[PDB]
Design a protein around this ligand. Sequence first.
Ligand SMILES: Cc1cc2nc3c(=O)[nH]c(=O)nc-3n(C[C@H](O)[C@H](O)[C@H](O)COP(=O)(O)O)c2cc1C
Lengths: 353, 94, 141, 835
Amino acid sequence: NILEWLENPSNTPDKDYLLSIPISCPLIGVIQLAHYVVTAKLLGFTPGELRSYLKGATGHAQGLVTAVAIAETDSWESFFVSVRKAITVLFFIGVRCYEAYPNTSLPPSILEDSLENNEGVPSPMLSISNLTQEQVQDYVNKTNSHLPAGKQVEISLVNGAKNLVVSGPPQSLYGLNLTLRKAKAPSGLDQSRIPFSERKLKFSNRFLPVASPFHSHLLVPASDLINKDLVKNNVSFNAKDIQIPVYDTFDGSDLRVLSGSISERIVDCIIRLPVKWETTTQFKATHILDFGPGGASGLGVLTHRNKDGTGVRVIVAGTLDINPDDDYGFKQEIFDVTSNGLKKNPNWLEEYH
Amino acid sequence: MKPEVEQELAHILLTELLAYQFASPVRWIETQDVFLKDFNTERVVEIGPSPTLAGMAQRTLKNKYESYDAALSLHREILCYSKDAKEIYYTPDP
Amino acid sequence: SIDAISQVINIAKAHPNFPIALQWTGGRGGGHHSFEDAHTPMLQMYSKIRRHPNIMLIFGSGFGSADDTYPYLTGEWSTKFDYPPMPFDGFLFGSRVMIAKEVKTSPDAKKCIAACTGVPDDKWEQTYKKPTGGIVTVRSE
Amino acid sequence: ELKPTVILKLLKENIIQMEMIENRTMDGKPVSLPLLYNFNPDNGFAPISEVMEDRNQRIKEMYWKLWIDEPFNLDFDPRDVIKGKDFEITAKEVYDFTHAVGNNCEDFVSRPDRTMLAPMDFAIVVGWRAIIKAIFPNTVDGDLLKLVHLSNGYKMIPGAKPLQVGDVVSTTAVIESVVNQPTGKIVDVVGTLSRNGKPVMEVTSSFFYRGNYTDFENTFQKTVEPVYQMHIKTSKDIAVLRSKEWFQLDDEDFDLLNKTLTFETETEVTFKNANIFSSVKCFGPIKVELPTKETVEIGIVDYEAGASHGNPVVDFLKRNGSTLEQKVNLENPIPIAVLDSYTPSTNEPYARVSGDLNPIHVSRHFASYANLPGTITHGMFSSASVRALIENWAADSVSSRVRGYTCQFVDMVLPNTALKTSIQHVGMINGRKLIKFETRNEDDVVVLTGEAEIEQPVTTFVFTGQGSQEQGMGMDLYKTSKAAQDVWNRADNHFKDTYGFSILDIVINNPVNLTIHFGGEKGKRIRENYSAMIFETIVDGKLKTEKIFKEINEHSTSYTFRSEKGLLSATQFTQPALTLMEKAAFEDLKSKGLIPADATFAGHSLGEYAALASLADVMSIESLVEVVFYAGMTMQVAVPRDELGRSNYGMIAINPGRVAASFSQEALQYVVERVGKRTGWLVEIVNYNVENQQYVAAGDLRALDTVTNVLNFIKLQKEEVEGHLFEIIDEASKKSAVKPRPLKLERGFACIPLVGISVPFHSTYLMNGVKPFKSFLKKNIIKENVKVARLAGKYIPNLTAKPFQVTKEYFQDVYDLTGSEPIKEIIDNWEKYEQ
Ligand SMILES: Cc1cc2nc3c(=O)[nH]c(=O)nc-3n(C[C@H](O)[C@H](O)[C@H](O)COP(=O)(O)O)c2cc1C
């Protein structure tokens, strides 16, 4: 009951329950759709013509559903049907994935060790930064060699060259984290006097705020149930109805030209296949509007860091804030009518040609 | 197997093991592998005046059971009677 | 290093009008040198440097021809590091011009310099252990 | 939705009926409790009078309809055992129960490629229909609306795996004790849950019928009295025991003097009134403590009496013997965590999953009629929630690690209340941590309090071998621990009586020389003990019998043990001292209750003997020290020693890691074998200690010198390979051979000679002496004292470094390393032994 939670913040549930995926998936969908509605209304656009202005659409795992929905949107009259499609898909993937791999209480010994090692609460998704994919993969394989098949960990989100996310059991990810801590240097280790080759690699691993291990073998049994549930509470995305390219999370291919069911492919992208965000980021665009959650901590700044120096400006459409560096936009840049609204990110190959 | 026959067999086997123990090499590699990997021993207690076997078990763990320990989150607490009496007795210092 | 580059960036920020020539040089450069790689600090700090137009980026520490300097001129040196192109504003040639006719280096010292075969970038760090490429690292006062 | 809850009417001109309808039922059909009241207009002040006749029967009938799904029949003996219907554990049921109690442990949640366990609290769900049937009989009369659940407890029997999804569990309830107290009637029910015939666990449940009851003829009480220990010091004690009729012995001539008797009695009392028992019976087995600390039945307590004011047996045992408390408190409690739980807004989720449809937990009107502060929640829910917290925190979210859990419901708990539970580790019981908890409500009022027996983490006990002996070993434990005192004193007394020396004194003072004197009858007996000591060796099929202490004869007035620096470093005294201080440390641990029942154990060298005497109690302290002292003294004659007492044998500690990274266990074994074979002398690896980081090689001092030299050479440098290694061996051997026989092994860059060792034990050299040593070990280790349960799965022998198992594969493994005729006979005749 979200209306009551919004009207009375006092009796809202706790953050862990809200973060649980059967809540988080549909509610992150609502947040993204609300950002889209605010943008379109304040610009005086119908969702269809705003989509037509958009060169393309895509999403990080969950946001792909919203991307396809706003891709299919036509007008305010039929905008709620696409909202219903997106919200139903998100609700069902959340419910079925939670059923497939619910959240259990981790050993408080593990929790205390993680906390005293300047680490957050263990979660089914662990983000690792400043490590190459091959290095993260060898660590994952070393951990998987000992773990059994049902408790394996695999890379879920290839956010960037030096940014990855490994999904699996929280306990298995804590074991991987123990190995990484064994292989990790202190942050405050002054290595300026050591040769670059001889320097011990340093990286940062932190558990994401997630409640289920997305893009893992663990949520695979949920996929068929989600597909059948969509066919029952009919939510189908048709290539003909979609009128802008939607870039796949796995291979970056447009979802329109896919022979198979777009809804089924989306579900596999969220639950089974990993997200190769760089491989999706091959589209040629000058401006990227990030409607996701997190604001400054959301997908927009990550995409900006990936695409920095290529002449692509990212605008965080969901937050009103000032970026001191002015290397990425905010909600005001979308609605600004002066030359301030039109900000082109530097392209090093051109500007410093 | 009847209980009495089982006892007789076990007594003969134990006698023979003890009899050949002083004439045959000590396979403490296999013993450590058995009680660290097959049983996943979480706490080792070493009954001795010095932490000899405790240091040996520690060495086996750093040399061999490191990725195993990390992956399966086995808190291998190696305690020796001579120095880790507080840990063995559950008498933490207030 | 990174801290020094950040300090240069702070100076440029404090004086956004005055031109600052950031003469980056990796550890592989001749004479006094650091332990830092010639490339990764630049891959890390290039965007911050270009956020200030009054900074001019000059690359040194291991350049002695136009063939090996053109990739840094166009910025395509970063494409092999999987970064966007990273054009550089200038270059400096310290060890190349040591055997030039107008330097006061003695003829035998010039012959000794020319005898140094040199090594690629990836194996310059061996100078800390052995005379790699005819050149070795030593500690000053 | 809205459904009828009460119907008030008149059945006749006088009977007012209040049908209190519970709509929450097993089959969904409403069940009406009719409460009848006489209406007397003549008595205008109080016209309405409760109809007591059949009131308790009606309440019981309605509760039976709600709880039990069998035809209503209250006429059955409370003594008779109640058999509950066979119940099948399902994933859905475990799912619902876990999410109703708040059990988030991963053990109970379905996971891929892993069997789903059921919570310990699920036992009450399995056995409610019998445990609650216990309190129904008309003989145990009482108002069920006034029932109070005083306490509930779970106890897994040892060796029983936790409940798992799919197993079929049978429940057998018995009324342990029903007693009329002034404030009400206590009824204690014990429900045994069994699986595949074997028992799984026991569920105790105490119920209180508040009211006044005088039907003592139907009251009885069975109590397992605490175990009592009595040391028989004098013949007065024996006379007092024999004067007791109840004290009966199978062997009337059994020698009770200097013996410890343990009494495990159970008292069954039937009451005549509140104070006086109508009949008192006290029955149990009396057992004696053997030298191996093993209690074996030698008699029985059998007391029977009619009207009596008490049980004289328990009074006598309390006054004379001492109570053995299995639980052992720590020096100070150890707080674990203070946790906040919340009682649910409704009790239907727990009621429908546990089967407890008590209306006081779901219906406002029934609670009002029961005078409760509100729709109070299941105490069993609170117990399940606290046990979830305990297995999460005390047990680190390991279901199997929780073996016992008792809880007392001191106060009622209302829904939507914050319960603060402080968990403390207060003691140990048979190697299980005893955890107290005290759950209080928001008003700082205790509402739950109980115990939890949580198994320790998987424990192994590794007993150290010779090498670390030092003066003052185990003496602080000898000062403090009483069990260590007893072990050391038994050892010292045996050594004084037999060989006339004090192992305690040797450990404390480390004398360089020790003179045993053979004056008087005691000295002559000690001299005979010394002369009887022989070293028997079957060499080349001939049983040589060398004599240890060849000096000692009938005319020897004294013998003197010599040492260079101290006698505690001599194998004769080093091994018994080490074995004794190990056994004393373990015995103090056992007295403190820190030994898990399932703990495994191994021992390096003598360490094995100490581990056997410690965990398995195969041999007593006396036999242990006898065997170990005999072995240590046979070492003195096992190797030909020169006139200076030094032999040409020893040991070195090789480190394959410090010679070269290439050097592995296989490489070192290859080099050692080639050294021995090519040079002709004896050398071999005796202790495989650490992988490529610590090994021991025993053999000739000269040969070990060549091994050290060759490994030094391999450190200094990097069929045909065999010939090259042979050349290195030849160089080292021709360099070392010319040295005098009593040479000193030099420290290599990787070889560390071991000081104080002059015999190559654990080597092929002492194979001829195994059989006579085996016979001596048989004389010392009695078959009856070997406990297969204590040894199997826990003992890892050094010969066969696998868990001890009496199996044909294990016996064949014994031959695979060392062939022996009895083993081959056993394997050949195995089909005969199994039958
Ligand atoms: C002989 C010699 C003297 C140098 N003296 C200085 C100096 O005095 N101050 C300084 O900042 N760098 C000095 N350098 C470093 C160079 O100026 C330049 O920064 C870079 O390291 C040269 O790189 P390269 O040898 O690969 O061409 C010297 C280099 C050489 C070879």
